[PDB]
Amino acid sequence: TNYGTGRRKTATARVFLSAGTGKLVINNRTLEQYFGRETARMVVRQPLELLEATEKYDLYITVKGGGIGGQAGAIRHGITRALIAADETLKPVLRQAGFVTRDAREVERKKLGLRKARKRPQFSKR
Amino acid sequence: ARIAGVNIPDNKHAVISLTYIFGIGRHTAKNILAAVGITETTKIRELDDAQLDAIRAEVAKVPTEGDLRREISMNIKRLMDLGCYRGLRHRRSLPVRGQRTKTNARTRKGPRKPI
Amino acid sequence: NQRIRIRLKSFDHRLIDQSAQEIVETAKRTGAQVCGPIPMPTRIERFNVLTSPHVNKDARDQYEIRTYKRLIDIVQPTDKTVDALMKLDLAAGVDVQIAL
Amino acid sequence: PRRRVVAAREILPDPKFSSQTIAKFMNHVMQDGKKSIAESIVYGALERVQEKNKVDPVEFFETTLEKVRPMVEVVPMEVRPSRRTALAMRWLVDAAAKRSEKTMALRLAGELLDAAEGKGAAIKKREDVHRMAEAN
Amino acid sequence: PRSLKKGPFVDAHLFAKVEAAVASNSRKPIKTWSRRSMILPDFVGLTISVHNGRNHVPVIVTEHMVGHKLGEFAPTRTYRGH
Amino acid sequence: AKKGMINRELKREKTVAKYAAKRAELKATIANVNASDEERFEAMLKLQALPRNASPVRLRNRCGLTGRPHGYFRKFGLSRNKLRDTVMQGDVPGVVKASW
RNA sequence: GGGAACUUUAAGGAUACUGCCAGUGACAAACUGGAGGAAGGCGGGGACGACGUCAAGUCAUCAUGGCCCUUACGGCCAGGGCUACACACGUGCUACAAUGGUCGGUACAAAGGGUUGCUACACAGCGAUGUGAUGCUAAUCUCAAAAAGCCGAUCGUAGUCCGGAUUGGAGUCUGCAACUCGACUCCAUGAAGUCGGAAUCGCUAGUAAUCGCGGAUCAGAAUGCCGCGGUGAAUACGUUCCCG
């Protein structure tokens, strides 16, 4: 019914939220089947746990790009935006939780003359 | 257990124990075990005498210790006698396969020799 | 079902956009229905050029050149459409390819 | 930093117990970005101690960390509250590694269980610290 | 090494000289700069003077040399010690 | 580069251009299964009997302006020293300073 | 079949200005805190290098004053050398293991390259690879398998089922041609190494650490260089001391 888009480290999540009984599916897979480490699943579940509404909604989620952590963060962001697009009064609680903020940190480019973004080759006076 | 003249470990898996014989690696060990019919996770200490004889029969089909060391010695001696470039490298105890010698030849050279 | 497919390539995106807009307006004047212009992904080639004549490896200039691509689809072309498109002038710096 | 004073970084609580102490201990355990392995070790240790004694893992860990926590370091100096926890976790990490259980989670659970009753190598390290401290 | 599907490589001029000597039986050495040519079974019993960069070193080809390149028996660098 | 080196490269290029067809035919015959083993051997000998400069592995890319044999950049056909000078004054279309 | 919603692609725009609220500075410049907001005080990164210093570097990219050679200090060729080796130094790669090795099963990227090129698929081989064949001048086809990760089994602290140097044997490919002097594959071998003295280096956040992917040069030949993303920390009391 309601829609949300989440983004985190080149990962984008499309989230479709409707009323239901707690069904969840990501890329035609169960949460357990998609995320192996449990912390990612817990990150995915944070928004509804903080609202005590885990068994009141059905989620249809697709995600593309990034890694496991990035995709989990993007799914959380998309779920938060979909909840806000359903109930406008819910935004202050989710903002206090910190979910509405888009994490803008990204990989810094490698620079000429350096081994990495900041790492510099070993120096010697002699 | 004694196979091919050496005492391989008894408490290890057969596929690891058979590699203690000169001239037998992991691939050869798996080949021998598959040809005999023994699983690779079976320990040596829990094998019977008939199975040991069967394994010895297969081991006899490859050059293992004395014949193989002899063959390698003859191969090196032939080059050193012929006097080709590889024979000269073997005589001088220097790298044979084209590696640099200005630095990094310590495996062939031995410990550093102070001037 | 005679569809005209036009592909535009350039090193300058302002030039390519101007050419695409001119083509679309020329087709709409004749009265056909057009789809686009659709921007295809851009190619970026990078180069590292040493600036010192002899020895400064960390002193380099980094250059790039981009190739922009546009796609235009013309469906149900009027008889005047092909003639007008061929009569359209060739702007420098833009490559135009037409497939029927 | 001469002029500028920099704020301390704020870290998120761990997803399971919402405990910043557990999160920081996991960060200390983790090497080269393998937070999954660090989580496995820490959560295994907590489950092990919980099944050994039916006590809340957070309370047990905080009580043991307070027991190991030093009021002074090592040549005596003074330390601040943050350094207290940092050094407590630091010393707690090593003794588990030198233990002899088959997995790191089991080793760390055993080390915590032994330090809680006072017969721990981290406890011995703290004893070395304070018997060094009375020198001055 | 060179692929077996191609066969051994021998320079045409050196091969022609070897064939001429073997058709004849002359014992004078065959002078060559072809360090890269492979020693064939026909080479056995002949003296080849292989260039080594500054000189032509004589090599008397025996049976055990077959399968080697001619340059393996004429080293190019001089070293006696430091 | 010295003028002799440039003339040497020109001569090698001309020889490669001259012997291109015969070399391709010889290699095709070598790789031809239906041909007899004797024919393949004769083709191999014929290919080995060509002049050395007929082979293209002996060509070295040199700057089109100065003949420098290092830092070639096939796309522009210019070594780095001339590429920098020509780019920074606007004579190379589409190339700009790269930042990202 | 269809839809133009969403992701994306890529052009043009909007937004942040101490704007609002609460104290300070000085009655200022400024400073501190809070709400809203994706973002709050320069949000992050790149490019851009003042007047000047070092007779700094480059006559071997190129140009150019002067000097020097002219059957040679010019030009052509084959072979050799730039790859040597009692030693010393700089910059790196791989390890010394259990937060690991191996085996089986199973997930998630970004960027870039491709027509004398990349190749689906089938057959042959243990394999490098070979043969036939298909699509692609590319958001269309392809390089391509991401890897660390998760689940299960085993190994149980041993110079080991750690490590992968060296050497013997047998091969593939590029190339006219792999001896000096190529890369890769298979069997065998299995060195030093059990965490490194005096001393010394990098890094303040998506950074360090760690994991894989691509390109320029290029017939072939990267642990170098230039880029790309995945996972993802610790600590800053302060200016005595060391350096500029």
UniProtKB/Swiss-Prot annotation, chain B:
Q: Does this entry carry the keyword rRNA-binding?
A: yes
Which Gene3D superfamilies does the entry link to? 1.10.8.50, 30s ribosomal protein s13, domain 2 (4.10.910.10)
Q: Name one GO molecular function term.
A: structural constituent of ribosome
Stored InterPro entries = Rbsml_uS13_C, Ribosomal_uS13, Ribosomal_uS13-like_H2TH, Ribosomal_uS13_bac-type, Ribosomal_uS13_CS
The question of whether Ribosomal protein is a record keyword is answered with: yes
Q: Quick one: where's region Disordered?
A: 91-115
In terms of Pfam families, this protein maps to: Ribosomal_S13
- Annotated family: Belongs to the universal ribosomal protein uS13 family.
User: What does the UniProt record say this protein does?
Assistant: Located at the top of the head of the 30S subunit, it contacts several helices of the 16S rRNA. In the 70S ribosome it contacts the 23S rRNA (bridge B1a) and protein L5 of the 50S subunit (bridge B1b), connecting the 2 subunits; these bridges are implicated in subunit movement. Contacts the tRNAs in the A and P-sites.
Protein name listed in UniProt:
Small ribosomal subunit protein uS13
Upper classification of the organism: Bacteria, Pseudomonadati, Pseudomonadota, Gammaproteobacteria, Moraxellales
Swiss-Prot record, chain D:
Q: What does this protein do?
A: One of the primary rRNA binding proteins, it binds directly to 16S rRNA where it nucleates assembly of the head domain of the 30S subunit. Is located at the subunit interface close to the decoding center, probably blocks exit of the E-site tRNA.
User: What are the BP-aspect GO terms?
Assistant: translation
> What are the TM regions of this chain, as residue ranges?
none
**Recorded GO CC terms:** small ribosomal subunit
Name the UniProt key words of this record, in alphabetical order. Ribonucleoprotein, Ribosomal protein, RNA-binding, rRNA-binding, tRNA-binding
Please give the Gene Ontology molecular function terms for this protein. Answer: rRNA binding; structural constituent of ribosome; tRNA binding
Q: Which InterPro entries match?
A: Ribosomal_uS7, Ribosomal_uS7_bac/org-type, Ribosomal_uS7_CS, Ribosomal_uS7_dom, Ribosomal_uS7_dom_sf
Subunit comment for this entry? Part of the 30S ribosomal subunit. Contacts proteins S9 and S11.
The keyword Cytoplasm is annotated on this UniProt entry: no
Protein name per UniProt: Small ribosomal subunit protein uS7
The record's comment on protein family reads: Belongs to the universal ribosomal protein uS7 family.
UniProtKB/Swiss-Prot annotation, chain E:
Q: Gene3D superfamilies from the xrefs? A: 30s Ribosomal Protein S19, Chain A
**Where does this protein have coiled-coil stretches?**
none
Taxonomic lineage of this organism?
Bacteria, Pseudomonadati, Pseudomonadota, Gammaproteobacteria, Moraxellales
Write down the superkingdom of origin. Answer: Bacteria
Please name the source species: Acinetobacter baumannii (strain AB0057)
- Has keyword Ribonucleoprotein? yes
Signal sequence: where? none
A single GO BP: translation
Keywords, alphabetical: Ribonucleoprotein, Ribosomal protein, RNA-binding, rRNA-binding
Q: Please name one Pfam family that this protein belongs to.
A: Ribosomal_S19
Choose one Gene Ontology CC annotation of this protein and give it: cytoplasm
As for what it does, the entry says: Protein S19 forms a complex with S13 that binds strongly to the 16S ribosomal RNA.
UniProt record similarity statement: Belongs to the universal ribosomal protein uS19 family.
Q: List, alphabetically, the NCBIfam families matched.
A: rpsS_bact
Identify this protein by name: Small ribosomal subunit protein uS19
UniProtKB/Swiss-Prot annotation, chain F:
Give one Pfam family, short name only.
Answer: Ribosomal_S14
Q: Which UniProt keywords apply?
A: Ribonucleoprotein, Ribosomal protein, RNA-binding, rRNA-binding
Q: Which Gene3D superfamilies match?
A: 1.10.287.1480
- GO MF entries: rRNA binding; structural constituent of ribosome
Q: For this chain's UniProt record, which GO biological process terms are given?
A: translation
Q: Does the keyword RNA-binding apply?
A: yes
Stored SUPFAM superfamilies: Glucocorticoid receptor-like (DNA-binding domain) (SSF57716)
Entry keyword Calcium: no
Its cellular-component GO annotations read:
cytoplasm; small ribosomal subunit
NCBIfam families, per this entry? PRK08881.1
Under HAMAP family, the record lists:
Ribosomal_uS14_1
Check the record and name the PANTHER family matching this protein: 30S RIBOSOMAL PROTEIN S14 (PTHR19836), SMALL RIBOSOMAL SUBUNIT PROTEIN US14M (PTHR19836:SF19)
The entry assigns this protein to a family as follows: Belongs to the universal ribosomal protein uS14 family.
Q: What does this protein do?
A: Binds 16S rRNA, required for the assembly of 30S particles and may also be responsible for determining the conformation of the 16S rRNA at the A site.
Q: How does it assemble?
A: Part of the 30S ribosomal subunit. Contacts proteins S3 and S10.
Q: What is the designated name of this protein? A: Small ribosomal subunit protein uS14
